[PDB]
């Protein structure tokens, strides 16, 4: 009930108006997710990202409540920090830390990452996934667009609008929520998928870092899914150009047999991650992609 939803949100949020706590707002996005602004927390100095949503015109308010509750109880260095929330009438405000280095998408479409840089990003993403999976949370929409970067090269996962919480019982999901091009075959070829769908998506993200886009980006999403389900593990355009350990890492992330596919815990031990360069090695790419917008 819209009424119950407001009472639930009322219990979650901090009290009052945020217009006092933040100052130099600046409107960025304005999609259907609500209006996003950059602003400054006046008491800590921290620059933040604030999403304002008019509730009565928000579709699935339960997903928003789920998102806040999951973020609040699953804080981690590799996840964009959820800071606070406020409700002013039917206006809901969600405050997140702001990362000034844009997203991984900007980097893969505007620059050329070397293997040491790719290994670093893959490691940081796997750290977030091991943490989430160990806490029974499946992100379900892993893709470069959901990987935000700090100017210092910090790598953090965001957008928990489609996550799932599982248990011993209800250990598998079946709802199709992810972005087509990054979806694991089992999301389609069957029902009941588990945490490893995020590992598959990470593998597609690695392909993005190598080739600039996920396989089949050129195709209608509807056709991509059929291809993903019928072609299975994607073929690289120039596999010979990659080191043997990077090819092995990709093979483990993109295996068709879910049981065979690596888990986050297993992949954090992979030798490909050991060639990772310091995260600050990403700063030049981030700066280049920020300028080339």
Spell out the SS3 assignment of the chain.
CHHHHHHHHHHHCECCCCCCCECCCEECCCCCCCEEEEEEECCCCCEEEEEEEEHHHCCCHHHHHHHHHHHHHCCCCCECCEEEEEEECCEEEEEEECCCCCEHHHHHHHCCCCHHHHHHHHHHHHHHHHHHHHCCEECCCCCHHHEEECCCCCEEECCCCCCEECCCCCCCECCCCCCHHHCCHHHHHCCCECCHHHHHHHHHHHHHHHHCCCCCCCCCHHHHHHHHHHHCCCCCCCHHHCCHHHHHHHHHHCCCCCCCCCCHHHHCCCHHHHHCCCHHHHHHHHHHHHHCC
Are 180 and 221 in contact, with CB atoms under 8 Å apart? Answer: yes
141 is catalytic: yes
Are 83 and 99 in contact, with CB atoms under 8 Å apart? Answer: no
* Burial (0-12, 13-18, 19+ Cβ within 10 Å), 262: buried
Among 107, 136, 59, smallest CA distance to 209 is for 107
Q: For the chain, give every domain's residue range.
A: 1-98, 99-293
- Given 41, 84, 141, 198, the catalytic residue: 141
**Documented resolution in Å:** 1.8
- In sequence order, what are the residues at sequence separation of 6 or more whose Cβ sits closer than 8 angstroms to the Cβ of residue 100? 47, 150, 151, 290
Among 215, 185, 208, smallest CA distance to 197 is for 185
Burial state string for 133-168 with b = 16 or more CB within 10 A and e = fewer than 16: beeebbbbbbbbbbbbbbeebbbbbbbbbbbbeeee
Q: How was this structure determined?
A: X-ray
* CA atoms of 97 and 151, how far apart (whole Å): 13
Angle between helices 115-134 and 244-253 (to 10 degrees): 30
* CA atoms of 190 and 42, how far apart (whole Å): 50
Q: What is the CA radius of gyration of the chain?
A: 19
89-to-7, 9, 144 alpha-carbon distances in Å: 11, 11, 34
Q: What architecture (CATH level 2) is domain 99-293? A: Orthogonal Bundle (1.10)
Residue 103 is encoded by which pair of tokens?
């997203």
Which option is the CATH number for 1-98: 3.40.50.2000, 3.30.200.20, 3.20.20.60, 3.40.640.10? 3.30.200.20
CB atoms within 10 A of CB 7: 9
Are 54 and 90 in contact, with CB atoms under 8 Å apart? Answer: yes
Residue 263 is encoded by which pair of tokens?
């888990």
């Amino acid at each position: 009930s819209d009424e119950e939803i407001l009472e639930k949100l009322r219990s979650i949020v901090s009290v009052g108006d945020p217009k006092k706590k933040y100052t130099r707002f600046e409107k960025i996005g304005q999609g259907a997710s609500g209006t996003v602004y950059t602003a400054m927390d006046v008491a800590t100095g921290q620059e933040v990202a604030i999403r304002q949503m008019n509730l009565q015109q928000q579709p699935k308010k339960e997903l928003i409540i789920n998102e806040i509750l999951v973020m609040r109880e699953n804080k981690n260095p590799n996840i964009v920090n959820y800071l606070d929330s406020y409700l002013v009438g039917d206006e809901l405000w969600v405050v997140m830390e702001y990362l000034a280095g844009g997203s991984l998408t900007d980097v893969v479409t505007e620059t050329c990452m070397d293997e040491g840089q790719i290994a670093a990003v893959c490691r940081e993403c796997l750290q977030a996934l091991e943490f989430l999976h160990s806490n029974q949370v499946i992100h379900r929409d892993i893709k470069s667009d959901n990987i935000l970067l700090g100017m210092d090269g910090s790598v953090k996962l965001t957008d928990f609008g489609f996550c799932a919480q599982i248990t011993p019982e209800q250990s598998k999901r079946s709802e199709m929520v992810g972005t087509p091009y990054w979806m694991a075959p089992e999301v389609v070829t069957r029902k009941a998928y588990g945490p490893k769908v995020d590992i598959w998506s990470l593998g597609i993200m690695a392909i993005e870092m190598i080739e600039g886009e996920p396989p089949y980006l050129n195709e209608n999403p509807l056709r991509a899914l059929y291809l993903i389900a019928t072609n299975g593990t994607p073929e690289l355009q120039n596999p010979e150009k990659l080191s043997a350990i990077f090819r092995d890492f990709l093979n483990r992330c993109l295996d068709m047999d879910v049981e065979k596919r690596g888990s986050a815990k297993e992949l954090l031990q992979h030798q490909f991650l050991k060639i990772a360069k310091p995260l600050s090695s990403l700063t030049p790419l981030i700066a280049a992609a920020k300028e080339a917008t």
